[PDB]
Design a protein around this ligand. Sequence first.
Ligand SMILES: N[C@@H](CCP(=O)(O)O)C(=O)O
Lengths: 738, 773
Amino acid sequence: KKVLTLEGDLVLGGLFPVHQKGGPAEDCGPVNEHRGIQRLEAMLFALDRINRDPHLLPGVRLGAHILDSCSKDTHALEQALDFVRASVIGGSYSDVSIQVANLLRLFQIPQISYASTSAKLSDKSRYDYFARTVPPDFFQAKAMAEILRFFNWTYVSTVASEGDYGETGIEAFELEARARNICVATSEKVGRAMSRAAFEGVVRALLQKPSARVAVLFTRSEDARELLAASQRLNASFTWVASDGWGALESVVAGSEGAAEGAITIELASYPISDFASYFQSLDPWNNSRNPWFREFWEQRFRCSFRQRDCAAHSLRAVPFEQESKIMFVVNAVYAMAHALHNMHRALCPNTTRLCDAMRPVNGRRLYKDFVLNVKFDAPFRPADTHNEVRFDRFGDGIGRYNIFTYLRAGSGRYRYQKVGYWAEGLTLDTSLIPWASPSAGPLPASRCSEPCLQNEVKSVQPGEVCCWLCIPCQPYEYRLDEFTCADCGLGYWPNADAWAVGPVTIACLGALATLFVLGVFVRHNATPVVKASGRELCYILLGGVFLCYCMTFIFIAKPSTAVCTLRRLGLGTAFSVCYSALLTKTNRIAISPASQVAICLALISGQLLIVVAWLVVEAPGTGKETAPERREVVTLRCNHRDASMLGSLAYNVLLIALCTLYAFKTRKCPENFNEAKFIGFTMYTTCIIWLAFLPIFYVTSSDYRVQTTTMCVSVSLSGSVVLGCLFAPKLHIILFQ
Amino acid sequence: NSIRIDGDITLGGLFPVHGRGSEGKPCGELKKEKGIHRLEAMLFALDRINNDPDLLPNITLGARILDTCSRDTHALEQSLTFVQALIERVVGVIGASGSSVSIMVANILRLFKIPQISYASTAPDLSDNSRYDFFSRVVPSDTYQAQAMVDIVRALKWNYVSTVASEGSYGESGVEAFIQKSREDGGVCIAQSVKIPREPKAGEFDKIIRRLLETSNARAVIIFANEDDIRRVLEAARRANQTGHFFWMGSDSWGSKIAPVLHLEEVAEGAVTILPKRMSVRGFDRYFSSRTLDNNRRNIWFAEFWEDNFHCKLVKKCTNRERIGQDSAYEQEGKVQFVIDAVYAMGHALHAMHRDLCPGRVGLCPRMDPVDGTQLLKYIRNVNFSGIAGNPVTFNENGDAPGRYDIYQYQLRAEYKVIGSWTDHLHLRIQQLPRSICSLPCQPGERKKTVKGMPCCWHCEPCTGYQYQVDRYTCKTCPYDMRPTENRTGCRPIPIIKLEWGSPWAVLPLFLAVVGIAATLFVVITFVRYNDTPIVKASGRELSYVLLAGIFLCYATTFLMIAEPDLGTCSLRRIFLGLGMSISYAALLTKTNRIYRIFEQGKRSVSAPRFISPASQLAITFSLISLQLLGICVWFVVDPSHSVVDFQDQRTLDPRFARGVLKCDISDLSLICLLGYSMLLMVTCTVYAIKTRGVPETFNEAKPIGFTMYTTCIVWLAFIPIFFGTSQSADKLYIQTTTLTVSVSLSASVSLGMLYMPKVYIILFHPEQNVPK
Ligand SMILES: N[C@@H](CCP(=O)(O)O)C(=O)O
């Protein structure tokens, strides 16, 4: 009926729960001392201070139409509409703040809540012009997730009440959690309207998944009570944290002081206005009659009656005064609106010290987007030691301050809340104040499983425990694929997608030089008996075997193709098909004239090796990188005829003369130039042995392509040279020394 | 201000009596064709409801009417008087009009639990029941009419179109619904979409047309805008001389309304627009036509109705007696059925409520004064009845009437004729007018490339090179067998070139080789006739035999080098490319060596060189021949004879001139290696000729042999530079072949010129000289 009408140049309407619900009996119940009247009086104290403020709106006296919500939606609109008719700060409970916004926006009238938090009033597609002096409990997600990060704590069970605010906080928490790589072990909502066993069931469900032995709660305290009672009854072993829906609330921790130790709560930090507490404590509305609902307040606050003027004898100040911290939002809402108006006037009435006609109409968005959210200062009457940067984000979220505190063991007294730290936009905490984490207390109970193993080891794929997957190595040829395996690369060792070769080069070159230095001795002496008595064409085919060993050595190291590996294998015949075989006729003539005997031998040499040539030039397998799933960094192989028994045909070609003819060793007894006759008998035998000594490399070195290439290259050059000298010794003795 | 009609219960009503307007009057001209036409009809229906013994029995239904103007901020402010009566009491409203008018009001009345019904705005937005929990239309939304427009464009087989809409939820979401449904169908691309401001500038419309005309593959335009917006565009069309350039179309925003088309009748010929399925109301048409304009009580604008419909005061004051039906002042109102329907529908819902809420009463029941509109809403959705003119009244729970509407054609001679109808499917029959379709179809070989990703559009790109078509969008390379059809429908044989033995160049060796054989035989016959005469025996009769056979083959080989390709040709060619060169040298080596050995042997011993006897010497010649035969056999083994067709050599830029070649596949490796061995015998012969420089004239053939080699080795060696130098020519098929034929035939000629021809002359013509020299 009454609206505390205040006079002014600009009138701000508003809406407070002066009365409780009268349910179906009356529309209005008794007055709300703490929710209604104290908040209104604080509003008025602030409004009078604003009108008397030398810097804030000096040209605009603020009048008012403050409505009685009667704690009902019906009244909120029957009365909110009066401010439209008349041409807003209000909203305590939320059904009211929402519906009022639905009407005010239609007339381009902005609304700031002073107490209503609800996250639904974030939806600007339905509620565009509004601001919330208090951020909804959704925000606590941010702090909650940060507390878990502080603790290195991460993998965790979580709970809401049956609250839609509970859903809101849980969804919000999931978002903030995922952003920080924090995993839900498991979670649920919790009815008020369920048996104690159901509350125990919730606690058991936590305790039934002990991958971490810790949890977090969104709630309202009636639930937090029975949850904490169930925790205590079950002797539940965990640590846990709650939303300020159970912040502090000594009342919850009374049945279960012991279980209550393992926990922290947020509260929105309290910064009571002592100036207003003073004004209210000394307030005496009997005389200061402006607020019409005080007569009821007096009668019930002090037990008296004004019917007989009995309350008149009991000054209101007689009853001790206390206030909710909430008073600061009542005040911030009026100052924030006044400031928005102030800035609006600086923008629309820039050169005038009194309200301008520009502000007679309702301005919509001009207030809302440009001045209402763009508020930034320290709140008046706030304790001097701190700051709240009153501001709103683009959705009207009033930016705020929050105490983070734990319930301490008191072996010498009652258990007490203790500030550990605070939240603001981020978290600060002193660990020494935590009973389960301060270093002397030991570590937090399991709150972890496994690391971001996403590398040379990658996660397992353990069913269920995804956020707890084991760490497992890949295999030494692969590259990163998923969080849990690796793709096979190209060929090479773990790709992430000839040291002694100088040996054979040196010996081959030296072999060739020595070979020809000696040939020139034999050739210079072609007209000398040392050559006339020799199978000179064969002497030369034999000597040439070392020169060929040299040539073959370089072929042996040619980039692999069938063009060269066939020759390579044949070359292991060739070297002695000539280096041993000339002994055949030397031996024969000492042991169809000699000229023909030589031609016959030459034909035999070529014939037998050519049989083998025919056998190898027809082999299909060639060169490549077959390599091995082992080693992997093996590059460019010679033809894949490893340990091929066809090689025995080369050994044969040599033994065909070298072992199979040694009856002729008797030649050493022949009375013709004994220096040579003795050596032919000696060297045929010795040579067979020397060559056989080199031979085993055919299988011995097959395990390593660089080693066997290097080895055969040296052995071929060396074997040939060692052997030639076996008989050249007496030939050169005579030529060079006689 | 407003009309206040007494009754026992009251129903609100809302209509654009004014349009929008200026800042001082947001309410300019009277829109009589949405407003007062329909208002009287509502009031008519209101009286009929009150006069209906079976509807709201014993209850007078009163009313409250307001003028929307059109700028909907006027609606609400007003709604506030209406609202104070709601919270003299009003039960509900007929609210309707355009978008901004309906959507603002749906958000105020629902907050007091007051139901609202629309005879008008079809916009999608109002089907959000979380925002319009108290609301229904009485018509199908733009979700249907947009689909219908898409179906009609697809029935026109058009693909490419321009749209225009003015501001406000109706236009802006409506055309956006058409755009999205068109895109979902995929059979259409939007050339463009043009917004009209609520307050456009004059001349913008000419600019709009010029923009509409840029997309010249469109000949049609779609409209959701209001009446006036359309005249500004079609008036511009007259100025722009676009009359009959275009098809034009409308959602419900315009149609049977005559003020759109009048004075611009040729503009938008055949234009197709939609109206919600509508019938006239004869009882009203009659009443309206016959009503005296000063006998209409409780209608504050009816005096204005006279003034605007009769173009004079009710100065030119004219007699009030004239019926509106007697002048141009009168016609049938296009939507009157809906406004009458909507008010009855609420009356029927109220009736259903009384039979529920107040089942034992007629006349007033106190329970309905503070009636919970939720129950009123239940009957708004639950009541189903045959409406006025027999049109069934039903709408779903989001308040859409189910889709049903009629398709009209603007016919000149001029009226909107029915083309057909739609209920999620078209039933149209056809007037002949332009087409709106994007890219035009493409020729054979014109492989389409899509214009961007735009489904209805392409570039008709002609296929190229050796490619032939495989899809409307795709062409692919024809294999080596063929060069494309010019139409690129497929592919056609590469013409294959053969080496012609009669070509201008092939004819030279073709006949020289024959002459060579004839000359060789002249010599052979003489030698045979004189086989037992010393003049023949002295040079080695058998050695002569082999040399002459060699010469014969040299020429036979060259003749055959230009022989028609076959496998028989390849095998014989390869064996003889070798033999036709090597036999001659093998024979020369044997004989030349015999001379050299005798010459040097005589310096040390009288004994003839051992094995110089023909018994061994002939074998030497044949052994050298066999060594080559074995090498040739290897060449056949590693890479065997084949008659093949070369496509790759002349795959030219213009495939009509692409030519393949039918050739014997003799690799240049063997073409040379088959000659290389023979060359080495030639080299050896040259060396023997050098070794023999000290040989005296007493050796009958020692000198002319040296001479044959002096020339022969050049004839041959000249082959290589030419063979390779000409290897890059398009004509190499005959150039390299004749290069080879010429040196082989010439070498044969050289041998005859020094060793046989002058000897034959003496053997045959001078018997007195037939001595062993
Ligand atoms: N303004 C209305 C015209 C039809 P009415 O006469 O109002 O029923 C409309 O846009 O649909």
